[PDB]
Design a protein around this ligand. Structure first.
Ligand SMILES: [Zn+2]
Ligand SMILES: [Zn+2]
Ligand SMILES: [Zn+2]
Ligand SMILES: [Zn+2]
Ligand SMILES: [Zn+2]
Ligand SMILES: [Zn+2]
Lengths: 156, 156, 156
């Protein structure tokens, strides 16, 4: 059983519809009032990819597989899983690849939200937004995706 | 010469054709009998991205460049390269981004296959599958891609 | 304030135009004379994603947000930021996902360029090129993208 330092990378992608001129997206727990997310879940690519990076770091079955609204249940889950396995989080670096919304505007709020739900300091979190040159599925605003990269550090 | 902890990220993408109604894919050493992979190589995005994450972690020339069927030759290669450089693998986290096949169904078999070819425990491996909302090249089943993230830990 | 080992992942994407038969791209500080990059910046996905992986590792505001030609100003910035925070770089692994140009041909020059601008050894750098099966925005040569993965190691 390996108990050294662990890497995780979560990935998520959700279909969206921008309320331009011809269910509301939540991103890092922040409501995005001009974008709908077309999903059975709440569409929070940031929360879901963070859960997936934790699960991945530790080698668990993923969320859908484990449990066959929901985003907070899973994040609390992931936090308590790191605890029971005797790890702390080192830092997490999140890349949201999204033509809309702009992330810089809501970045402080996402970071505080993550830090509360993971119970870690704001200095252990980075959330960055990248547009996609208005090319492809993302750049045409049909979808948004997120990569979350995390290190877990063995306690003591 | 740096001998501390090392990060690697491998990436791979292969063209596929799903045998719907109008050479066989291998994924993590598992044959996928309803999908053809259109490739000169065996199309194993999982094996190839794992090799590339190891090579990347250590700063080698990549597979094609190094050696200008094949997937086992390269994986044995990568395992023995980690050995000769005096590293062990920490853990590896693999994200297959594929509309088909579903990964959860074959996940145990891929993990055992990786653990045998890398000679590491099953607890050091995570393999996760993500669909792509039926959007773009991946979501339309024209291709499958994989990201493999690894840490190498200096021996002793 | 967390001062253990840190992970960063930078991502960047730029629009390009290949000078086929019907401003010049710089990649890892190397000029690519058959490709134009359609950008307000110099289009160096490799330099920019490296800066973003450093900023991400450390939890800074990103480049555009921090400072609202340019690629060297930012890289020197990132190097001196790692210094002032009391970190060294472990290693960096870069995946350029580009149908053109081929990276293997210019890989030595990019690695020497990175190692000079970051002031680290060539053994701490890996730069890998992956084509995209001539599918999608990348495979059709409309864009090139890069992922840069880095570990920062607390001094002493
Ligand atoms: Zn999701
Ligand atoms: Zn995508
Ligand atoms: Zn391959
Ligand atoms: Zn792709
Ligand atoms: Zn850029
Ligand atoms: Zn892309």
């Amino acid at each position: 059983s390996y108990n050294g330092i662990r890497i995780g990378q979560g990935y998520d992608i959700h279909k969206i519809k921008v309320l331009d001129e011809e269910k509301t997206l939540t991103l890092g727990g922040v409501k995005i009032n001009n974008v709908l997310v077309l999903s059975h879940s709440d569409g929070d690519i940031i929360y879901h990819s963070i859960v997936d990076s934790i699960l991945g770091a530790l080698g668990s079955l993923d969320i859908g597989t484990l449990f066959p609204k929901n985003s907070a249940i899973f994040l609390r889950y992931a936090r308590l899983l790191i605890y029971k396995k005797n790890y702390d989080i080192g830092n997490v670096d999140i890349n949201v690849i999204a033509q809309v919304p702009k992330i810089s505007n809501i970045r402080k709020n996402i970071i505080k939200n993550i830090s509360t739900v993971l119970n870690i300091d704001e200095s252990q979190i980075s959330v960055k937004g990248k547009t996609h040159e208005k090319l492809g599925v993302i750049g045409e605003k049909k979808a948004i995706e997120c990569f979350a990269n995390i290190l877990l550090i063995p306690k003591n």
